[PDB]
Symmetry: C12
Subunit: 66 residues, 12 copies
């Protein structure tokens, strides 16, 4: 399955998983402090991922930094 | 399964999921504040995605950037 | 590549993106209005086998771009 | 499935679906006025598409404009 | 499933579908007037397609243009 | 790539495109006549496992071109 | 399935199908006269093809001419 | 491409590579400590659907490199 | 299913099919005279092919030409 | 099924297989002396591999060389 | 790519190409002798999971060439 | 399945197959003398291969020589 790479560029970045299915709510928020990296898949439970805070992000479509 | 990457370039960008099926309504609107990013898949429940507000958008087909670049890729 | 979609960015107000029914019959089942700079990323689906766009729009598909509309 | 992109370059372009199966007749004609775009799949019901009028057409094989 | 793109460059171009099976007959002839386009698939019923008349033709294998370009691609 | 086909353009009158039967036996089952500039796009099929072309023709297959015949 | 393209460069070229299975014998010989083309698949009945006479041959591996 | 993995090389002592549980709940199930120059090649699996790395590390995934950490 | 192309560059080139299974024997030797070509598949019965005699050989892995070119491809 | 190539550049390089499942322990450590090579797959039993010691490592994602090159590929 | 094979051209007399048995046990099951310029195109199979070549040979596999032996 | 190519660059190179499954032990060691080549698959019984001695090795990931 597809995955996303997120590197926090400041303290307190949040990577938030939104629930798969008819209903949509946040099911988990992972905090990242400056420099820390999360590599996260889309899954049975997660069909959208929201990133809050300054981050460098890689997906299959390329890079987004800031 | 395809996904879209959306970066908000203003506050209050709305990423709107429309229902898969005979009927089309929005089932969810996810708000993004400036600089926030949403990576959203098409799914059993969402077969079209509408973005309202200045956004930088990447899909498999390329990049669309409000008031900026539009490039096939 | 087991599902495809179209990207539509409105270049003026009042753009419409219209889904045509899959099957023996062909009728408009939904028209989605876009104002200037709004983006619709829409799949072909069990219910939609053709998409019509009216108004000035920038469109991306697997086949490339059609712009300045 | 394969799809075709058609942009009308004048008013009154017609995109016509021809029926799949042993019999061949037109089952639908979609009118396009100048500048309007139809993105149409091949389907269970449509195995050939005919375009009448001045159009810019994209398929997997490339572009045909005029 | 393969398809062919045919553009008529004169009136009365005939795109002829021949029957899939032990026997070969034409089951349909679709007439194109000049500048009209037919995008036709091979199918359960059509296993060969004959084009009579000046036409610009694209397939997976390339382009054939009456009195013009023939290019592999 | 789950089915293949051959493109044959006649460069003179009286070109023949001939299908040979699939199976233990091999016989001509159909000859299709092409006049100058006529095009045949023909698949390999349940019934046709070899194709013979006689006369001057431009031919395209997955393997490339054979022309000036 | 794979196929071979053979163009006869002189009269009397023979394209010969050899039988698939434990036994190997010629099951068919197609004669080609100068300029004629045979496009032949590997099949249930044919697992090797022999070309006799001057020919220009294309396969997935490239061209052999002479 | 029916399974993916991440390569993590520690650029300092005390790097941690942390697996997050697959499923409705998300919790750290294992933290693997790496000292300077140690390498972990770790798959996504039935039990691990997200990986967190803390500390200075060079990382390779299918999407490319993230370094100087 | 892979195949090999063999062109004989002398008379009496032997293309030898060896048996698929626990045991290895030649089950067939096809003789090629100079300039003849054999396009032979691996099959349920043939899991190795030996060529004896000057030959130009193409496979998926490249070209081997007796007293000439050897090239990966 | 992915595999990793590990070349030891000192004695006593340890290639450590960690267990596939809810629990993570090392089930095996294969020692390599300088210049020895291990080509190891991920498997039903091994879902992560740890390398301790100076090593030249190749995977699908590229090359990592202790005190040397790191290159995506 | 659902089956692979190796190409071996002997560059001297007495080259041997040796098949090693697939399964729990590993033993030579066949040695095929090649004289100078003879070519063997040999698959991996239900019975052969490793191939040993002794003597001077030019070899092609999916991974490239190994020559001047 | 994947395979490895090993060419011995000195006498007495050993190519060692390690067992697939929960247990890991050497199940076979093939000796190669200078210049000899082993082309070895990963299999039901072999999920890791160890090479001892000076060798030129090719895999899908490239070459390692020395
Ligand atoms: N338990 C979550 C873990 C996860 C994967 N990707 C995520 C993205 C954001 C938050 C959590 C996750 C799941 O399997 O779905
Ligand atoms: N619960 C929604 C989450 C979602 C995915 N993509 C979206 C796009 C827009 C809005 C919501 C979503 C679903 O699985 O479909
Ligand atoms: N309910 C519609 C939503 C949709 C998808 N693609 C569209 C294109 C145009 C209009 C509506 C749509 C469907 O699933 O088919
Ligand atoms: N109801 C038609 C819609 C359609 C798809 N492609 C077309 C091309 C032309 C006309 C109509 C169509 C169908 O599903 O087949
Ligand atoms: N009813 C025909 C339509 C068709 C498809 N391709 C064609 C080419 C030529 C003529 C007719 C056709 C069929 O499904 O086969
Ligand atoms: N009825 C023939 C039509 C055909 C396809 N390809 C051909 C090539 C040559 C002659 C006839 C054909 C068939 O289905 O097999
Ligand atoms: N009846 C033969 C036709 C054929 C295909 N390829 C050939 C090559 C040579 C001779 C005959 C053939 C078969 O289906 O196998
Ligand atoms: N009857 C043999 C024909 C054959 C195919 N490839 C070969 C190579 C060499 C000799 C014979 C063959 C078989 O099907 O296996
Ligand atoms: N009977 C052997 C033939 C063979 C194929 N590849 C080989 C390599 C070496 C020696 C023999 C072979 C087999 O099917 O396995
Ligand atoms: N037992 C864990 C091992 C593992 C794989 N990838 C990981 C990443 C981080 C931590 C542990 C792991 C699992 O199979 O899931
Ligand atoms: N009998 C062993 C043969 C083998 C394949 N690859 C190897 C690598 C090393 C040692 C032996 C082997 C097996 O099938 O697994
Ligand atoms: N018996 C182990 C062998 C193994 C494969 N890859 C490894 C990596 C490290 C240590 C051991 C291994 C297994 O099949 O999983």
């Amino acid at each position: 399955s597809d995955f996303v790479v997120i590197k926090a560029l400041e303290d307190g970045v949040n990577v938030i998983g939104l629930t798969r299915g008819a209903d949509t709510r946040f099911h988990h928020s992972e905090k990242l402090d400056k420099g820390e990296v999360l590599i996260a898949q889309f899954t049975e439970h997660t069909s959208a991922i929201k990133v809050r805070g300054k981050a460098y992000i890689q997906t299959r479509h390329g890079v987004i930094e800031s």
